[PDB]
Amino acid sequence: IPEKLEYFINKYAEHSHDKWSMDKLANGWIYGEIYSDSSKIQPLMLLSEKEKEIYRWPIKESLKTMLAWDLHAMAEMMAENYHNIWAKKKKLELESKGGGNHPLLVPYDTLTAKEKAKDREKAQDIFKFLQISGYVVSRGXXXXXXXXXXXXXXXXXXXXXXXXXXX
């Protein structure tokens, strides 16, 4: 967790809270200590105390995973990690409680597109602020190098052919 990125974690959390505030004021929500859903009354204006930071908490984990591990790449790695953490939690809890089988207990190369879109939304949401902040990110001529490798292979093959034809 870099110090500059650690500083920007709070700012990004505030920006996400502001976006959610715009959404909830468009929907209609007013602050109130009483917890309710049909009365349209919440004390953090349905996001509760911990539910306000349920999405702020994994931003640091996302940064750590990015450091430990183009733009479409960051998108797909982030969505894959999103699905993997939830799948691990679900499999752990179902193994603990002896529950039923979840259709999402399958490798990410088999899921329905809506399931991938659901966390691709959050991936893009967290990556847009990183891009606007000037953070260049990579996964961590081309044809010319390919041709050079091919030429090296051809040289090896020619050497082999010469060694064979010499006999």
Query: Torsions phi, psi of 42, nearest 5?
Result: -140, 150
Chain centroid to CA 66: how far?
Answer: 9
Question: For the range 73-82, what are the long-range contacts, defined as Cβ-Cβ under 8 Å and sequence gap of 24 or more?
Answer: 73/139, 74/123, 74/127, 74/137, 74/139, 75/120, 75/123, 75/124, 75/127, 77/139, 78/119, 78/122, 78/123, 78/126, 78/127, 79/116, 79/119, 79/120, 79/123, 80/108, 82/119, 82/122, 82/123
Contact between residue 1 and residue 115 where contact means Cβ atoms under 8 Å apart: no
| HEC profile of 77-92 | HHHHHHHHHHHHHHHH
**Way the structure was solved:** cryo-EM
Q: At how many Å resolution was this determined? A: 3.3
Look up residue 112 and give its two tokens. Answer: 């329905």
Phi and psi based region of residue 136 (left: phi greater than 0; alpha: psi -120 to 50; beta: remaining): beta
